[PDB]
Symmetry: D2
């Protein structure tokens, strides 16, 4: 028995261009970022990949990538399920700030720790901060104390896992063809469990943008292999 799982990281956003920390900030794809999702959709169509369900975040840049893939591949009827659990890693009080001004405010050494470490997060938001996800209507049905004030990669890995165990994985076991269209850090959390990686290994893992990552899994969901369609 072989199941097939496809992971896809969204392309460039407008804030990647302006050199700002994004996190849960809901910024759009750039034109190039849209172009990547379309190209990803071609490669999947060219290899005749089909899907019974698409999982993505509640952030437009991921959602739009999912949409462009399904449109390009002629699979618009496929249900799309959107969850905050697949959101990008939250960047705390860094969200919105220029990456350079931060590197001269806190120093480049401290800023590097917050980006590259596994378990040391950036400084928290207060709940009175306008960037606190609890103020955003997008999250009105979610209990507000489930929402982060800040995240390290470990936090992201821990919030993605219940969604893997409760929705994605059961669908795979039911013989559904799943695509996960999400963000680097949330996808790294999925990959960490899939291949049972150490902290060192997940930190060295870089998932390229707009390139479908295909996992073949056995009856127990142990990876038989993985590869990129490029």
């Amino acid at each position: 028995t072989t199941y097939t799982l496809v992971l896809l990281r969204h392309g460039e956003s407008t804030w990647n261009k302006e050199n700002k920390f994004t996190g849960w900030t809901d910024v759009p794809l750039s034109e190039k970022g849209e172009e990547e999702a379309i190209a990803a959709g071609k490669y999947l169509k060219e290899k005749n990949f089909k899907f019974d369900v698409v999982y993505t975040s509640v952030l437009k840049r991921a959602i739009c990538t999912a949409w462009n893939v399904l449109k390009t591949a002629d699979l618009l009827h496929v249900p799309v399920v959107k969850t905050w659990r697949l959101n990008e890693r939250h960047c705390g009080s860094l969200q919105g700030l220029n990456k350079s001004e931060t590197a001269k405010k806190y120093g480049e050494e401290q800023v590097k720790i917050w980006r590259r470490s596994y378990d040391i997060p950036p400084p928290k938001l207060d709940k009175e901060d306008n960037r606190w996800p609890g103020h955003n209507v997008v999250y009105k049905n979610v209990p507000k104390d489930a929402l982060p004030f800040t995240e390290c990669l470990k936090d992201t890995v821990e919030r993605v896992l219940p969604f893997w165990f409760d929705h994605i994985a059961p669908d795979i076991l039911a013989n559904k063809k799943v695509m996960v269209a999400a963000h680097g850090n949330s996808l790294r959390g999925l990959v960490k469990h899939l291949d049972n990686l150490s902290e060192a290994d997940v930190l060295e893992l870089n998932i390229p943008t707009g390139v479908p990552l295909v996992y073949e899994l056995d009856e127990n969901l142990k990876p038989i292999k993985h590869y990129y369609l490029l």
Copy 2:
């Protein structure tokens, strides 16, 4: 006084509307004009400050792409979209794919007129060997084959829509969710027939414009208080 707001929206022009070809369940895309109409609907809904908790649509791309363009322009991409065959356009049977001169040649122009304007007289049936039968399309692989039409009249479309109203749309409205239904002329006519308790005569005369939001204000029992177009 408890009031609820429901928004209905018919998709814009498809590629086959130009060619004057009967579409039905054929999954033809919106033309560029159909794209822009969905955007314009979205722009206007954003301007009048409309918000949605759920969008219901068909499994046909011209309707789905309309929902998408509205959510995107209105900055509501996080909103769930639920897609169902029960909101599909009326099935046109053996007319699907053919233009008016082809159908006149096969059936005579007078038979075709009856099928266009009737309530309960459907056009000729497809059978299981015809490649246009929804049963051969993998889009419907999880739908029981005998739920899928070989042909439909408006009465059929009306009857298959009603269950989805009672099971999914109406309960959402009663839970104070702000619903948009983005669909097709005939499936929307099926919802309106029930809402306003229209006779067969009145539903036949009803002509819902394309790409114009149709707003229904409903009371606590979902009886309409009023309806109007945003245009």
Copy 3:
């Protein structure tokens, strides 16, 4: 590719003994009625029938039948989905009345028509009547205009079939082993569709109490055969 579907009719209610028209009246199984479901479970256990989902009505005489089956087969973990659409045919203003009282106030032959006919329903309740389902909190999430003042067998067939098409049949097509536990007329509606019966045929059909009705279906859900486990 063959699928297996089980149908089961609940045992004797307390009102069957009293000889009153039941309908949607939510009367319990008699003790005998509980024994019938327990025996039904034993039969299914003996032939090692497993279930992934049980569908039933929102009426206790059917819910409790399902419970007793799952309990006897040691399958309590299996999800039970309850719906108004699988309810018994509504008996209108006859609900709660004696079968002799109805003969008196309506005539004996008029009553037989209401029971045996396909499309002639008994007299309507009005909105002011206490027995109208709209006053019952059980149906508080159901829009009130979807609920009947009375029903003929045609009505029952037409409310059951959307639930067959939307929920039961798609489960079967997902290779889930389904049991439907319900009522005479709601089951007769399902059978009518399964076997594409005429009106005359469905009116002659007599589904016995507490005996599992097994359908073998092909890949398109067309019945290959059916039989009773006894």
Copy 4:
């Protein structure tokens, strides 16, 4: 705004009479444990407690509690949602062994540590052991990695919290009346989060069997107060 949540721990299982470690072993309620469930049902009905949903585990001692309550309260129409996440704390290789026997092998103080600590689990099951939930068809839809070889209370707490955030809390915020009918340790997991308890507080917390525990919560689901119905 405020909300009302009801918790209930199941009564005595047959293995409690034998002083045996149960964990995920799916043993039935004792007759006393059935009566407790029925008595709980009478109390709730008397005080006019209604429910829109009942959450329970996939273990029959909890499921049968939920059923006996609904039956006595005359609320059989209410959906029951069963989840492994609400299962009892897993007892590793101790499952099936009696408490006197276990003292001789490991020593009584070491057994106390496994019974009473927060973060030290009993000896873990082998993957090849018959008792590993991964061999149980009840969990065929759950990825094997989610299935424990052993648990400390900390593990149980961490597996219950996602179900709180994903299912229970959104229902409460959607104005649904929820009952959770489960196990001592899984309920302690919920209470730990609800009352923001320290590790020390939750270890001393002792929830009696078969007594409904009512929580009153504010608009952000923070408890205003809680009490037992006795």
